[PDB]
Each structure stands twice: as structure tokens, then as C-alpha cells.
PDB file of C-alpha atoms in Angstrom:
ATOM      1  CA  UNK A   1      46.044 123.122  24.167  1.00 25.33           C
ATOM      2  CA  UNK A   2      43.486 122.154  21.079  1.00 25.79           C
ATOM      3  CA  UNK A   3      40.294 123.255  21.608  1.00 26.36           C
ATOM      4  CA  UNK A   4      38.339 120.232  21.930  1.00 26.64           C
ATOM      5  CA  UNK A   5      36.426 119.334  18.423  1.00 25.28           C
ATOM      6  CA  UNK A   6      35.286 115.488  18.830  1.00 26.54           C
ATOM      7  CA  UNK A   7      32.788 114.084  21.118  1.00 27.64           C
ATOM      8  CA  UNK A   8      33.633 114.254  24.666  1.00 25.12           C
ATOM      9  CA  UNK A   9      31.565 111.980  27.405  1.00 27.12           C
ATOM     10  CA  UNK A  10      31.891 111.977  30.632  1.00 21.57           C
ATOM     11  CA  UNK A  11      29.666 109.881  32.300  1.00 22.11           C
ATOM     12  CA  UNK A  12      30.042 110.743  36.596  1.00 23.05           C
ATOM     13  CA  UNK A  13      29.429 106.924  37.168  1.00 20.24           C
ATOM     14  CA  UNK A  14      32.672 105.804  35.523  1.00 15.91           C
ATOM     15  CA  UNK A  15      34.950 108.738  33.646  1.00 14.71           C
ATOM     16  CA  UNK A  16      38.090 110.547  32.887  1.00 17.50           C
ATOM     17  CA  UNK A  17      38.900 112.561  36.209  1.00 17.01           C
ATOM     18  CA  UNK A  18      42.176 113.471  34.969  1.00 14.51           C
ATOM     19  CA  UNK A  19      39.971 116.276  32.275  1.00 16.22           C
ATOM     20  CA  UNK A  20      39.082 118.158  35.476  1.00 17.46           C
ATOM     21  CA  UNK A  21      39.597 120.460  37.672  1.00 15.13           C
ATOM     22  CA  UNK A  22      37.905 121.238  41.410  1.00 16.04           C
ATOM     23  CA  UNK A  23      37.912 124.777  42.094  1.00 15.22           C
ATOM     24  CA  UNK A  24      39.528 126.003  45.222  1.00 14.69           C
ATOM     25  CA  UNK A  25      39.037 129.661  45.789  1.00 12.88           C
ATOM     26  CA  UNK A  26      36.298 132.382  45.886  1.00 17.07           C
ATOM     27  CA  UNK A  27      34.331 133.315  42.759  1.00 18.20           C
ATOM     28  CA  UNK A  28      33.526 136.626  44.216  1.00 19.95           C
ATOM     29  CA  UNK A  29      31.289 138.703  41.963  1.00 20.73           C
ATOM     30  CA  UNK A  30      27.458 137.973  43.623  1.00 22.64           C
ATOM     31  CA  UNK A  31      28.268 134.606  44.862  1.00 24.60           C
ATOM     32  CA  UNK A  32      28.651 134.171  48.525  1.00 26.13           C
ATOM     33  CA  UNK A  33      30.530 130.940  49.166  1.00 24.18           C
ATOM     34  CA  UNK A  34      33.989 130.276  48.455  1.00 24.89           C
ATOM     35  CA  UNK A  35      34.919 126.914  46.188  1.00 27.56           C
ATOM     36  CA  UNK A  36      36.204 124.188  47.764  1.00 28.15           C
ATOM     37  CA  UNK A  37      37.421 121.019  46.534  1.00 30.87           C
ATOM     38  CA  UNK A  38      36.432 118.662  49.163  1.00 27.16           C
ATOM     39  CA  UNK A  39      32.323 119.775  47.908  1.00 26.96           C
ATOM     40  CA  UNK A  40      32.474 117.964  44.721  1.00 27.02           C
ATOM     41  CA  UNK A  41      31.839 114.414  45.925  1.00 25.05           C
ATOM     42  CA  UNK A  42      30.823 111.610  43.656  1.00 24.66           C
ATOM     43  CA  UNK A  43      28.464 109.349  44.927  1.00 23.88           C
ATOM     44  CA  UNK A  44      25.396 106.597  43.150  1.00 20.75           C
ATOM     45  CA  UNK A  45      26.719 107.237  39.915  1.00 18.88           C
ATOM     46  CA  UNK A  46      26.736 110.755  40.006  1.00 20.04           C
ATOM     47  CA  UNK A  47      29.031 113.901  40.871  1.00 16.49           C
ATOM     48  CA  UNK A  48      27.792 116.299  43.752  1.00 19.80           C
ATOM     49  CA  UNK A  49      27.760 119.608  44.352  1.00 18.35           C
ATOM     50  CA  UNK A  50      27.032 120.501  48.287  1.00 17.24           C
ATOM     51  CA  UNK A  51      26.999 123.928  49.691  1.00 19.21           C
ATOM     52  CA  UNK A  52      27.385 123.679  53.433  1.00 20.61           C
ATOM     53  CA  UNK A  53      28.025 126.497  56.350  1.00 20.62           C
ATOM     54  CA  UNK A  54      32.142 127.045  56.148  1.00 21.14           C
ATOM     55  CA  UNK A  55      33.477 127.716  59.416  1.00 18.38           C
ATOM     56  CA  UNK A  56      36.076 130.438  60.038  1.00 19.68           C
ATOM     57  CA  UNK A  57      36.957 131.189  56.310  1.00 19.33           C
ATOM     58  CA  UNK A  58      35.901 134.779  54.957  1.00 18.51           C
ATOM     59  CA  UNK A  59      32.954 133.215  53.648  1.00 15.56           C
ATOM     60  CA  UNK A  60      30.185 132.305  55.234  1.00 19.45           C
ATOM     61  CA  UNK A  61      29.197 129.344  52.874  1.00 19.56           C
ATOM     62  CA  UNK A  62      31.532 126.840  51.127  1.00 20.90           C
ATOM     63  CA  UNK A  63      30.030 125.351  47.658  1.00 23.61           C
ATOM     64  CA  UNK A  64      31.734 123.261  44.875  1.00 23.44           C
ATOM     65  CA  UNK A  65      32.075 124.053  40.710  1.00 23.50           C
ATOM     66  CA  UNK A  66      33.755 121.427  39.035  1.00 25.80           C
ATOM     67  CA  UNK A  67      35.502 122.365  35.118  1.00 26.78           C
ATOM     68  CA  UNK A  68      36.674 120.762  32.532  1.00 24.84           C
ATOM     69  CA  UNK A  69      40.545 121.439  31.401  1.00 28.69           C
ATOM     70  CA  UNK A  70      39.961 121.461  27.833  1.00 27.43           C
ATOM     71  CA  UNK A  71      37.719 124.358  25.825  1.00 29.20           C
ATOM     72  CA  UNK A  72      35.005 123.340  23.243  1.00 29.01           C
ATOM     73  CA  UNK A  73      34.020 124.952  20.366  1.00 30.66           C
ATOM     74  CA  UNK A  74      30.689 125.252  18.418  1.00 29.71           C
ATOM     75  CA  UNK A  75      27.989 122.382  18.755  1.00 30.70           C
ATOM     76  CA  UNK A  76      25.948 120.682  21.175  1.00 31.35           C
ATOM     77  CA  UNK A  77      26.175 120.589  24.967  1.00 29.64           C
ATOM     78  CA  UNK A  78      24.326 118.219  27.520  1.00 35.38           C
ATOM     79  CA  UNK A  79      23.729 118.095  31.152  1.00 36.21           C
ATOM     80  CA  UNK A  80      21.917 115.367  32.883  1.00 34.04           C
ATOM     81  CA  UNK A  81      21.372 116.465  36.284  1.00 30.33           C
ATOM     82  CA  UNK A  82      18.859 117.091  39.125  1.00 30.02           C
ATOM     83  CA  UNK A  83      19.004 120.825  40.846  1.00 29.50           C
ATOM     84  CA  UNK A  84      19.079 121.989  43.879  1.00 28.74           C
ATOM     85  CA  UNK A  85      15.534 123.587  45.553  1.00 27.71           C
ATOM     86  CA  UNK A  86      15.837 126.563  48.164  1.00 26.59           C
ATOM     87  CA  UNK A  87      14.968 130.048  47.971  1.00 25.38           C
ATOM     88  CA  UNK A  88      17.723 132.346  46.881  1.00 23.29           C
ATOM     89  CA  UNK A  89      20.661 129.852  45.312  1.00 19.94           C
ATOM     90  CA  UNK A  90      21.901 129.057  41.813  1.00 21.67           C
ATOM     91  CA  UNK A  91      22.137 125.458  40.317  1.00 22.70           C
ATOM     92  CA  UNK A  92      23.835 125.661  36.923  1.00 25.13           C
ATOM     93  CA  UNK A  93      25.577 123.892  33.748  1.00 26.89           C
ATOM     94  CA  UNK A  94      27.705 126.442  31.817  1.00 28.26           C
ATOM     95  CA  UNK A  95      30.031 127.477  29.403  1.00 27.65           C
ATOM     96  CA  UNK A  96      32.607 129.988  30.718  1.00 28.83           C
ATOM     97  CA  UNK A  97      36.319 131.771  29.414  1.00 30.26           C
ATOM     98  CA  UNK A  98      37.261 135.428  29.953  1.00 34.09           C
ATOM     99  CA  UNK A  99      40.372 137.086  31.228  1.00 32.27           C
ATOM    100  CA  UNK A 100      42.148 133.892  32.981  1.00 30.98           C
ATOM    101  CA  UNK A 101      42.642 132.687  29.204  1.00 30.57           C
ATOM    102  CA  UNK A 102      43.115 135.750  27.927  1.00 30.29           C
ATOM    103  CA  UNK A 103      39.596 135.411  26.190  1.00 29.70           C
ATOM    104  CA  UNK A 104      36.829 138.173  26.348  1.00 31.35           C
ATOM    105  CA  UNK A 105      33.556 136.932  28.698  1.00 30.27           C
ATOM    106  CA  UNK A 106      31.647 134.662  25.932  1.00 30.24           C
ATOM    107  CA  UNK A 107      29.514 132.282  28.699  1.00 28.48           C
ATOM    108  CA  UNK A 108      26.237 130.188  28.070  1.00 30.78           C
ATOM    109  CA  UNK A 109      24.269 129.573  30.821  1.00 31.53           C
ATOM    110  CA  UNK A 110      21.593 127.537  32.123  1.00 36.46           C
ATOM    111  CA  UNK A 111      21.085 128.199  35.651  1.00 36.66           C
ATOM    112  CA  UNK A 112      18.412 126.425  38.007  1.00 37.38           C
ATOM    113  CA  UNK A 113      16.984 129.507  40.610  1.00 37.62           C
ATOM    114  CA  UNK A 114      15.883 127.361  43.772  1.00 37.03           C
ATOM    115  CA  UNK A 115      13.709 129.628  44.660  1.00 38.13           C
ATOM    116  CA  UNK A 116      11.690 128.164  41.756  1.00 34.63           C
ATOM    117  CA  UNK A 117      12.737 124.865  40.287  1.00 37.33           C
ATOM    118  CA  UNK A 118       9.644 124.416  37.954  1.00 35.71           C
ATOM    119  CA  UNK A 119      11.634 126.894  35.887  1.00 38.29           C
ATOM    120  CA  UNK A 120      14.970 126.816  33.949  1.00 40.18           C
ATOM    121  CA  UNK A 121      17.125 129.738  33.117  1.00 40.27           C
ATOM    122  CA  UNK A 122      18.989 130.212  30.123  1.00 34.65           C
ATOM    123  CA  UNK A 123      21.078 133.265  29.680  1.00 31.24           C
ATOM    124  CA  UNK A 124      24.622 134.048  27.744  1.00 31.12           C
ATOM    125  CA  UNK A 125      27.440 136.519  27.627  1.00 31.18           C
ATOM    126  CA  UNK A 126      29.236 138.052  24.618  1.00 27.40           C
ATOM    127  CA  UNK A 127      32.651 140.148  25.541  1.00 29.46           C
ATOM    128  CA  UNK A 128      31.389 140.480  29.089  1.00 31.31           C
ATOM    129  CA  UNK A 129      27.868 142.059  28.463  1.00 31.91           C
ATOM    130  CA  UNK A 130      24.887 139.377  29.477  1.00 30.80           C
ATOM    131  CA  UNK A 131      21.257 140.886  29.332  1.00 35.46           C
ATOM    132  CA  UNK A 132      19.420 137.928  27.912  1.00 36.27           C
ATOM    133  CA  UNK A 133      17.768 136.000  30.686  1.00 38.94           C
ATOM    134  CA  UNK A 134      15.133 133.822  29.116  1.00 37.35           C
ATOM    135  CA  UNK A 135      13.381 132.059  32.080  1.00 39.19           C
ATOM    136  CA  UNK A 136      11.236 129.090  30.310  1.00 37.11           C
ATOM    137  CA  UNK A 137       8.503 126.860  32.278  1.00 36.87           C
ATOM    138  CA  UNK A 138       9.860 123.083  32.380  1.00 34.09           C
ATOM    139  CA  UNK A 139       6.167 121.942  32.928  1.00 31.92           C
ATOM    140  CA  UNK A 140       7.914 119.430  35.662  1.00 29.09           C
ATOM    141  CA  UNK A 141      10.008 119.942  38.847  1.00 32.43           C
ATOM    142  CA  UNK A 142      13.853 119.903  37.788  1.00 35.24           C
ATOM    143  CA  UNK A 143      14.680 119.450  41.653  1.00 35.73           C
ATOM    144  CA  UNK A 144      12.499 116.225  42.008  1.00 36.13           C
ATOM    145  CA  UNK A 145      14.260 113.745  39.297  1.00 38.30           C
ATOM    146  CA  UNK A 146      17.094 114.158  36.372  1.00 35.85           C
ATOM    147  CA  UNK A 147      16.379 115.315  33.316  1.00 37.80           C
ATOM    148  CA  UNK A 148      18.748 116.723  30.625  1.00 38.99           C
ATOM    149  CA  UNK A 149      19.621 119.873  29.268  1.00 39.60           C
ATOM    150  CA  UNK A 150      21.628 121.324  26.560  1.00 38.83           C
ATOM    151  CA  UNK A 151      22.168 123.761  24.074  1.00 38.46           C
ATOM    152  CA  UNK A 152      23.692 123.960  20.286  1.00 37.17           C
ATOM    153  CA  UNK A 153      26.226 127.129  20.392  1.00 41.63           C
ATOM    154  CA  UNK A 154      26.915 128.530  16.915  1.00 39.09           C
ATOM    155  CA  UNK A 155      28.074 131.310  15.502  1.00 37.99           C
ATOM    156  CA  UNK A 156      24.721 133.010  14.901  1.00 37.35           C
ATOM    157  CA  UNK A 157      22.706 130.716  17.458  1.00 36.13           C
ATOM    158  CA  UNK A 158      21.960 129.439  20.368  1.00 38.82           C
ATOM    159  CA  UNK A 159      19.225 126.626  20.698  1.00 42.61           C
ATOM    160  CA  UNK A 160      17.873 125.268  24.435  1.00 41.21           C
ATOM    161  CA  UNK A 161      16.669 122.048  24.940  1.00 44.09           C
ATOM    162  CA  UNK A 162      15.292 120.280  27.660  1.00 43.51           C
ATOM    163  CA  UNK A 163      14.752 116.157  27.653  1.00 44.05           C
ATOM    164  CA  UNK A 164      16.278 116.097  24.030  1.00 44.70           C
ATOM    165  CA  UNK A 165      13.597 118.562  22.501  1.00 45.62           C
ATOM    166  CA  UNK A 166      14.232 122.444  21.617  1.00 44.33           C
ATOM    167  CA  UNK A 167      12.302 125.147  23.156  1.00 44.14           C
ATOM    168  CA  UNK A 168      14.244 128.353  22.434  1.00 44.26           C
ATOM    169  CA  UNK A 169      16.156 129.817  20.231  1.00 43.67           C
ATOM    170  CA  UNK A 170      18.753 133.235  21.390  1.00 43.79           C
ATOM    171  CA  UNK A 171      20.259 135.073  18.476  1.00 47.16           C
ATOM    172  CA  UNK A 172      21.378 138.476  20.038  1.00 45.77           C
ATOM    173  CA  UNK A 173      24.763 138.819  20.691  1.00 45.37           C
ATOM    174  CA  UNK A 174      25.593 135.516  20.179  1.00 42.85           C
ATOM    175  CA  UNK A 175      29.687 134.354  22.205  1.00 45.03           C
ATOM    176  CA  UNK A 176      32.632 133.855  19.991  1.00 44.86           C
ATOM    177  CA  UNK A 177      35.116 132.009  22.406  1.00 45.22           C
ATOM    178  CA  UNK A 178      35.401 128.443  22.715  1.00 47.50           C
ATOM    179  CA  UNK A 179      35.120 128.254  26.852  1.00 51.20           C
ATOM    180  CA  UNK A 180      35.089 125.675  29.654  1.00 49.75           C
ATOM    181  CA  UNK A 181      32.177 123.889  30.529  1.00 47.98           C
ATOM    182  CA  UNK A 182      31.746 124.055  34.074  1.00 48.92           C
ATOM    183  CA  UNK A 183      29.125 123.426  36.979  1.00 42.84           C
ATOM    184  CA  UNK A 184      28.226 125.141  39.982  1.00 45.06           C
ATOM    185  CA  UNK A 185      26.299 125.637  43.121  1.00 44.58           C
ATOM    186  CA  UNK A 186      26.074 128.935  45.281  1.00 43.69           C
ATOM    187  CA  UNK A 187      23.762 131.600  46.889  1.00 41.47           C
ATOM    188  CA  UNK A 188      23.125 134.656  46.390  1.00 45.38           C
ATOM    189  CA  UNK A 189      24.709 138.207  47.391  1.00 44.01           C
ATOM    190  CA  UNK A 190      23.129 141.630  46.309  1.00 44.46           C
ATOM    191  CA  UNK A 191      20.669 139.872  43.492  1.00 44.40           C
ATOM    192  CA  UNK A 192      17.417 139.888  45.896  1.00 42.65           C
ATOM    193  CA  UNK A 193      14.889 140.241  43.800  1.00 42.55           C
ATOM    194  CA  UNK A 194      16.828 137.822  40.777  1.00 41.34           C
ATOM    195  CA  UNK A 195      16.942 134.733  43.116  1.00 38.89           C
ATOM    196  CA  UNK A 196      15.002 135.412  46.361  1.00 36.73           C
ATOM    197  CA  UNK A 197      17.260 136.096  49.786  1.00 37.63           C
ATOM    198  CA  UNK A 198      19.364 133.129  50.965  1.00 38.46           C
ATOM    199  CA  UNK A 199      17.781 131.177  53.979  1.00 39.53           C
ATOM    200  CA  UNK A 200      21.210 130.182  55.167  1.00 40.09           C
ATOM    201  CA  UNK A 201      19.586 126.736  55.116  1.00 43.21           C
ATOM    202  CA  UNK A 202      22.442 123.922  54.759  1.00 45.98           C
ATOM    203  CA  UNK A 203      23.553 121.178  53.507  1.00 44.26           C
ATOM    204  CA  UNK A 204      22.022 121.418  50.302  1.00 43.37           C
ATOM    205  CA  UNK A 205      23.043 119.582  47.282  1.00 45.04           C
ATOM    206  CA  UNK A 206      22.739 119.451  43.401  1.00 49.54           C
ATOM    207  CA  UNK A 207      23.866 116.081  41.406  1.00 51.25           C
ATOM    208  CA  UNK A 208      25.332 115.477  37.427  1.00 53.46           C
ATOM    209  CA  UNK A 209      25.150 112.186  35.678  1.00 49.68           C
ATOM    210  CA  UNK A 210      26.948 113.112  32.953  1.00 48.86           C
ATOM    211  CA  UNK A 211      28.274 116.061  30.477  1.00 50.56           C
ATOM    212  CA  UNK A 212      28.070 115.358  26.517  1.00 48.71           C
ATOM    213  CA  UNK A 213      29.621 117.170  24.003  1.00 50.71           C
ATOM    214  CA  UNK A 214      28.938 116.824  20.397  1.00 53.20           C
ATOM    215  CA  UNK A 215      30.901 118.562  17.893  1.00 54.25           C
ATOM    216  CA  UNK A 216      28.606 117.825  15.005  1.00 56.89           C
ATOM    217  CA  UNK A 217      25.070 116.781  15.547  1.00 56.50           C
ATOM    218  CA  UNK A 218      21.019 117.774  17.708  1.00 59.22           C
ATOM    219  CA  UNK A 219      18.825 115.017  19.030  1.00 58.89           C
TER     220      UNK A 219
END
């Protein structure tokens, strides 16, 4: 139960499954699919996320988010990855803890809205109470190859980057709570004019290479 304070690598091609966990239940909240295992499928070196029609469940779409056991503290995070394109879904890499561990909502997010994949999202939480969506312009199409993505979390900080260089920098209400880092892959319920209406358009399908965690050091 340490929070996690060395470098942790976990390359989709060849890791540690054992350090995570396959969701298997219903986020709720404005995300219309329930988690199921069997959509986090690895395949060509990399780990997929497929939202698909579910058939006789209480939700009307079934989608994957895959987690890591252990929490990490302050430093830098990276995603390479290759998001999903269609009008009103969610592609994401994340930091998450709240109530399940006790924790207040501290969250980092940085969230792919199909509806428009030559833009990335980055947004955060601090004790539950988000309101800093920061949409930047990639200047490429994040649905059409992998690139990678990250951020260094610290305690007055956060700093984006995309393909190893930084392009933001969020200091309001900055999280406290080492969390989980986590990926997902849903539509939209209630958040119309956020991520465009769901077409109800299936399979669809967003895929990881790896997750990077570096206690210490920035590219």
C-alpha cells in the first residue's frame, strides 16, 4: 500500500498485468456505457479500449477503462496512444482517487473529444471541484497515428505536454492526492454541447502503447 515513488513502465507490448485492474461495473455520472472487462483487449503491441452496443444490460453501450493498482505521487506522467474519432465520445489518460480510497476528488485529465480529434483536452480536479478545461490545438490528428502525452503534477503545477514538448502550464487549484492512473473510453449523456450527441455508431476503438511514470525528471 506505498504510494508508488520510482519509475513505473508499462509497455502494452510486453508488461506487468498483475499492476492492473479491468473495470467491471457502471461509472455512472455522464457516461453512458457500463465497464466491462472483456473491452480491454490487447492486440499489435498495444492495449484496446472498444466501446460496442451491449445487449440486454441497463446500458445501452459497453466500453472498457483499464487502472493501475498502485497510486503515484508528484512527477511526470506519459501516455502513448492513438484516440478514438466520433462525434460525442471521450478518449482519455487520467489520474483519478476520491471516496473509494477515502481520498477527496484530486483527478488530472487529458481527455480526447471525438467529435474533434485535432484537439486535446486537459482539465483537473481538486476536492471534487473541476472548472479548468483547457482545450489546446495539437496542430495534427491524434486519431490518425500515436503520439504521446503527459503531464508533470506538483504541488503548485501542472505542466501538459504533447510529443515530449510543454505547451501549458495550470496553476489554479492544483490536486493534493496521489491517485490511480487510469484510461477510458465512453460517450456521452447530458453534456451535448461539451462533446457533441452520441451517433450510437459502434465498434469504435482507442489503443495505448504504453504508460510512464517518472518520479523525478521532464523530457
Amino acid at each position: 500500500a506505498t504510494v508508488v515513488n520510482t519509475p513505473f513502465v508499462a509497455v502494452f507490448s510486453n508488461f506487468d498485468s498483475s499492476q492492473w485492474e479491468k473495470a467491471d461495473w457502471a461509472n455512472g455520472s455522464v457516461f453512458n456505457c457500463v465497464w466491462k472487462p472483456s473491452q480491454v483487449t490487447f492486440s499489435n503491441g498495444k492495449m484496446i479500449l472498444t466501446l460496442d452496443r451491449e445487449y440486454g444490460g441497463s446500458y445501452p453501450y459497453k466500453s472498457g477503462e483499464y487502472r493501475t493498482k498502485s497510486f503515484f505521487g508528484y512527477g511526470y506522467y506519459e501516455v502513448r496512444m492513438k484516440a478514438a474519432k466520433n462525434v460525442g465520445i471521450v478518449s482519455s489518460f487520467f489520474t483519478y482517487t476520491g471516496p473509494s480510497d477515502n481520498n477527496p476528488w484530486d483527478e488530472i485529465d487529458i481527455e480526447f473529444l471525438g467529435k474533434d480529434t485535432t484537439k486535446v483536452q486537459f482539465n483537473w480536479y481538486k476536492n471534487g471541484v473541476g472548472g479548468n478545461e483547457y482545450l489546446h490545438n495539437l496542430g495534427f490528428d491524434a486519431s490518425q497515428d500515436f503520439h504521446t502525452y503527459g503531464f508533470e503534477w506538483r504541488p503548485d503545477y501542472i505542466d501538459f505536454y504533447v510529443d515530449g514538448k510543454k505547451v501549458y502550464r495550470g496553476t489554479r487549484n492544483i490536486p493534493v492526492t496521489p491517485g490511480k492512473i487510469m484510461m477510458n473510453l465512453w460517450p456521452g449523456i447530458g453534456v451535448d454541447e461539451w462533446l457533441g450527441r452520441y451517433d450510437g455508431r459502434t465498434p469504435l476503438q482507442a489503443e495505448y502503447e504504453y504508460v510512464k511514470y517518472y518520479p523525478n525528471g521532464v523530457p
